Amino acid sequence: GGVMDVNTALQEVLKTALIHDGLARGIREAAKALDKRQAHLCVLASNCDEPMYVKLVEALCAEHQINLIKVDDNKKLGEWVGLCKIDREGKPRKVVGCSCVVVKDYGKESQAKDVIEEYFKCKK
Amino acid sequence: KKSYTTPKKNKHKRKKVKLAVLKYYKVDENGKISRLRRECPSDECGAGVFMASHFDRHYCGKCCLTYCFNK
Amino acid sequence: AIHRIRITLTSRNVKSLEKVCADLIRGAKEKNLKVKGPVRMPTKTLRITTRKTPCGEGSKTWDRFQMRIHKRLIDLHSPSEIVKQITSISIEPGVEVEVTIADA
Amino acid sequence: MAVQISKKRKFVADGIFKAELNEFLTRELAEDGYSGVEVRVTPTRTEIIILATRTQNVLGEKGRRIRELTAVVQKRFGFPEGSVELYAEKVATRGLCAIAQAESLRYKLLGGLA
Amino acid sequence: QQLYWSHPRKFGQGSRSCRVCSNRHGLIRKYGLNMCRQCFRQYAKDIGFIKLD
Amino acid sequence: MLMPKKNRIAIYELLFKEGVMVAKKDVHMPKHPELADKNVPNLHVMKAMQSLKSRGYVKEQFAWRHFYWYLTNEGIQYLRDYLHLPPEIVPATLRRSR
C-alpha cells in the first residue's frame, strides 16, 4: 500500500492489527502491553494530557523494547479508530484521540507492515 | 398488587469515584522506571498489573476471592 | 451360520400388524427356512383417567382414554444375511421391527 | 448410543415428536396453504413429508426455506447429523382439506373483507 | 452484582415444570407426561391417542 | 456488560456457520450446553438475538418453549462486514434443493 512514508505507514498497521487484536488503546493498557513482551511497537502523539507520560513512555521503551515513533496531531490517529470496527472513520457520534497506541508484533506479519518498521529500525 | 409506599433511604449503585489515572509509575530519570509496590505474583495474573498499596491490607484486585496478604 | 433369529413386530393397528407378519411367514416358508409361527403376547392397556373440565365447576365428570399396543414375534432359524436382507424391505405402514441376534 | 427405552415409553415419545412438529410448521407455513405432515422413519434415514397445497412458496428460490427447516430439526431434537431428509408433497383435491380451507378463510378475513 | 440468584430446588413441586410455558399447579408426571392436562385434551385428536372408549 | 466481548463473537460466528440458531427459555442454564460450548452461563444467546432482531436482520419463531431464529440476507451483509469475512462466503448453505 504505502511507500514507507511515516503517515501512511501507521495506517497500514491498524488495518490488519485490528484482525490480530493487537491494539492496546489508552495509556494504562499501552503500559501493561509494553510491560509485557506481547508488544513490539509504540507510537505516541501530541500532548493533550500531562507531561508525565511523554517521559514515561520513553522510559518503558528503554528498559524493555525500543520501538518508539512520535507523530503529532492526535486527531489523525483518533480518526483512524472506529467505535467497534470498520463502518465510518468520519463519525460525529464519537471520535476522540488515542494519544498513544501499542500494537503486538505490529499486527499481522505479512506484506508492507514488515517493511515500514524494518525501514525505521535500522536508521534509529 | 397495589402501588409501592414511600421509603426514606433508597440509593442504588455507587458512582465508583472519579480518581486521576496513571501515576503508578514514577519517573525521576530515564531510562529508569521507578516502580513502587510489587506487581502481582500469580500464574493466572499477568504480573503487568500493580498490587494495592493499601497498608495493613495488601490485595490484588484482579483476584476476587484469593491472595490477600495483610502485613 | 444358521442362527435362531427373532423378528419382533410391535404396532398399535391390528390390520397393519397382521398382514406384515403374513408377508414374512409366506416369504420364509416359500424358501423353507423352517419358520415358526407368531407368538401373540398379551395386549397392554395404557389408561388415563382425568378431568373433563378445566377449572373444575359444574357436575363432576371424567374421561377414560386408552391406547392399545400389540406385540407378536416370529422366530426363524436361518442365515442372518438373507433375513436382514428381506426383512427391512416390503413394509408399507408405520410398524416397527426389531431383529435380534439370538435368544435360543 | 444405548440402551433403549421401554416399549410403553417408545410410543409416547413418538407422539410428542409427531405433535410438536405439527404445531411448529403451522406457525410458519400458514400463508403457504399448510395441510399437515406425514412422518416416516426409513432405513438409516428420516422422512418428513411436509404436505402443503402450494409447494412453490414452501420451496423458495434455490431451496432456501427447505434448507432452513432441515437445519432447525437437525439441532432442535438432537438428531444425528445428515440423517434428516425433508420431502414436500402437493395434495390434489383441496376442498376436502378442512385444515387448509379454514386457514385460507382466516387470511381472507384478516386481509380485510366482509 | 450478586453472589446468589438461586437456592436448592431438587425435589418438590417447584423443581419440575410443565410444558405450557413453565406452568405448574397441575402436578403431573404420568408415564412420562410433563404435559398439561388442559392441552392433553386438545391433543386427544393428535397422536398418542384416539378416543375409543 | 450486559455480557463480555468474547461471548458476542462465539454467538455471531456460530450463527454464520449454520445459518440458524435455536435455544430454550431458561435463566438457570449453567453453561448452555447444546452448542455454544460451555462459555454462555446466562441468557446470552436470547439477549443478543433480540437486539439483533430489533434492527431487522433476522426473523424469530417460538413454539413449545423453544426459540428459532432465521438469519436473513440483510444480516448476512452486516455479519460479513462486522466479522471481516470474504466478499462472497456463505458456509451456512448454498446449493439447489431437489
Resolution for the entry shown, Å: 3.6
Q: Which residues span the domain enclosing E36?
A: 1-53
Domain assignments of chain F as residue spans, ordered by start: 1-98
How many angstroms separate the CA atoms of D69 and D50, rounded? 10
Residue D18 contacts E where some CB pair is shorter than 8 Å:
yes
Contact A120/A36 with Cβ under 8 angstroms?
A: no
Nearest CA distance, C70 vs chain E (angstrom):
14
Q: Is E35 annotated as a binding residue?
A: no
| Residue D27 in grid coordinates | 406457525
CATH 3.40.50.1950 fits C2-102, yes or no: no
Q: Do chains D and A touch (3 or more CB pairs under 8 A)?
A: no
CATH top-level class of A6-122: alpha beta
Tell me which residue has cell 438475538: F49
What SS3 class is residue C85?
A: helix
Residue B39 backbone phi and psi in degrees, to 5: -95, 145
Which of F20, F34, F35 comes nearest D68 by C-beta? F20
DSSP chain D: ------HHHHHHHHHHHHHHHHHHGGGTSGGGTB---EEEEETTEEEEEEEBS-HHHHH-TTSHHHHHHHHHHHHHS-PPTT-EEEEEE--S--TT-HHHHHHHHHHHHHTT--
Query: Would you call F84 and A87 a contact, using CB atoms and an 8 Å cutoff?
Result: no
CB of F93 less than 8 A from some CB of D: yes
C75: helix, strand or coil: strand
Greatest alpha-carbon span in chain E:
58
**Angle at CA of residue D65, ends D64 and D67, nearest 5°:** 65
The CATH number of the structural domain formed by F1-98 is 1.10.10.10
Domains and CATH numbers, chain D: 7-90 (3.30.300.20)
Within 8 A of A87 by CB-CB distance, chain F residues are: 81-82
Cell of A18: 485490528
The reply to whether omega before B61 is within 30° of 0 (cis) is: no
CB spacing of C71 vs D7 below 8 angstroms: yes
Q: Which residues pair with D49 in a beta bridge?
A: D38, D87
Residue type, A13: V
Which of F90, F74, F78 shows the shortest CA–CA distance to A87?
F78
CA distance D55 to D25: 14
Which of C50, C51, C65 lies closest to E51 in CB terms? Answer: C65
User: Over the range F31-66, which residues count as b (16 or more CB within 10 Å of their CB) and which as e?
Assistant: ebeebbeeebebbbbbebbeebeeeebbeeeeeeeb
Q: Rounded CA gap, B62 and B49, in Å?
A: 8
Contact of D50 with D33, CB cutoff 8 Å: no
H or E segment at E38? Answer: helix E37-40
H/E stretch holding C70: strand C70-79
DSSP chain F: --S-SHHHHHHHHHHHHHSEEEEE--S--SS--SSSTT---SSTHHHHHHHHHHTSSEEEEE-SSEEEEEE-HHHHHHHHHHTT--SS---S--S---
Q: Nine-digit cell at C76?
A: 426363524
Of F75, F48, F79, F60, whose CA–CA distance to F22 is shortest? F60
What HEC string does chain A produce?
Answer: CCCCCHHHHHHHHHHHHHHHCCCCCCHHHHHHHHHCCCCCEEEECCCCCCCCHHHHHHHHHHHCCCCCCECCCHHHHHHHCCCCCCCCCCCCCCCCCCCEEEECCCCCCCCCHHHHHHHHHCCC
Residues of E in contact with C48 (CB under 8 A): 30, 40, 49
What is the Cα–Cα distance from D34 to D99, expressed in whole angstroms?
8
Phi, psi of A16 (to 5 degrees): -95, -30
Which among B21, B33, B48 has CB closest to A59? B33
User: In Å, how far are A13, D87, F88 from D48, measured between CA atoms?
Assistant: 53, 6, 32
- φ, ψ for residue D50, nearest 5 deg: -90, 85
| Cα–Cα distance, D4 to F35 (Å, whole number) | 24
**Cβ pair D24:F64 closer than 8 A:** yes
Is F81 near chain A, with CB under 8 Å?
A: yes
CB distance D7–C67 less than 8 Å?
A: no
Of D106, D111, D63, which is closest to residue D87 (Cα–Cα)? Answer: D63
Tally of domains in chain E: 1
Domain ranges of chain C: 2-102
Gap between the Cα atoms of C51 and C86, Å rounded = 47
